[PDB]
Amino acid sequence: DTPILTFMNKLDRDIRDPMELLDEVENELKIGCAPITWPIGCGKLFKGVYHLYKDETYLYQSGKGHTIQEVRIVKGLNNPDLDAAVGEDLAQQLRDELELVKGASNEFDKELFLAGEITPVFFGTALGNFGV
RNA sequence: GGUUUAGAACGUCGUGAGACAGUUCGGUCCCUAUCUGCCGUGGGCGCUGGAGAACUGAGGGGGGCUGCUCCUAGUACGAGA
Ligand SMILES: [Mg+2]
Ligand SMILES: [Mg+2]
Ligand SMILES: [Mg+2]
Ligand SMILES: [Mg+2]
Ligand SMILES: [Mg+2]
Ligand SMILES: [Mg+2]
Ligand SMILES: [Mg+2]
Ligand SMILES: [Mg+2]
Numbered sequence A: 001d002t003p004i005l006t007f008m009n010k011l012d013r014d015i016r017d018p019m020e021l022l023d024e025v026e027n028e029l030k031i032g033c034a035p036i037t038w039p040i041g042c043g044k045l046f047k048g049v050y051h052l053y054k055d056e057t058y059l060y061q062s063g064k065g066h067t068i069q070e071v072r073i074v075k076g077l078n079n080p081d082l083d084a085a086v087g088e089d090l091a092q093q094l095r096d097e098l099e100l101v102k103g104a105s106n107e108f109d110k111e112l113f114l115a116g117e118i119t120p121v122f123f124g125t126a127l128g129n130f131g132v
Numbered sequence B: 001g002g003u004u005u006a007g008a009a010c011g012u013c014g015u016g017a018g019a020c021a022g023u024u025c026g027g028u029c030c031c032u033a034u035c036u037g038c039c040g041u042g043g044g045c046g047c048u049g050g051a052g053a054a055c056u057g058a059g060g061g062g063g064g065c066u067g068c069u070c071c072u073a074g075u076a077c078g079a080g081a
């Protein structure tokens, strides 16, 4: 009955739909998904992750994987600086996906996590040292 | 330096002088450029009164190589490497 944290590695790479990634984790691993962060773009378009519970956006910088990059936050989820820093196009897809996410996922519950029934899912990149 | 002169020897051929597209050691490389051409550099005259400058630019030449590293990114691609 050991608890599981989930880390979605390799956001530097062109990946699958993180929605679909949640299905594969719930369906095939028989365990609930509770997103904590959410990727904004992937591959050449990875811009960072929006934290769902802190409501802010940590901005990914390319190739600082050897040390820890400068923590660069954009506060609001509708902050027009998220549009400026990420492009308003990608910024809306963040907003859209987040809508769908809330209707098909889970709030992180500490009790169910310790019971091994939901996993806190973090999206990141261990190579870029971002999300760790 | 090689190799078609003259010296000398070996093998080889020839009775021999010699000979071998066999080898071996030695062994004189001239020219003050008239013309053409070319690199530079002046003189003359022209250009329509003479002169001092600053120009335009028809055209002509020069130039034109490329390694490695880093960012993108160990991303696309790839099961990996
Ligand atoms: Mg791929
Ligand atoms: Mg001779
Ligand atoms: Mg002789
Ligand atoms: Mg003969
Ligand atoms: Mg002549
Ligand atoms: Mg030219
Ligand atoms: Mg030329
Ligand atoms: Mg040209």
Ligand SMILES: [Mg+2]
Pocket (backbone or CB within 6 Å): B078
């Ligand atoms: Mg293959």
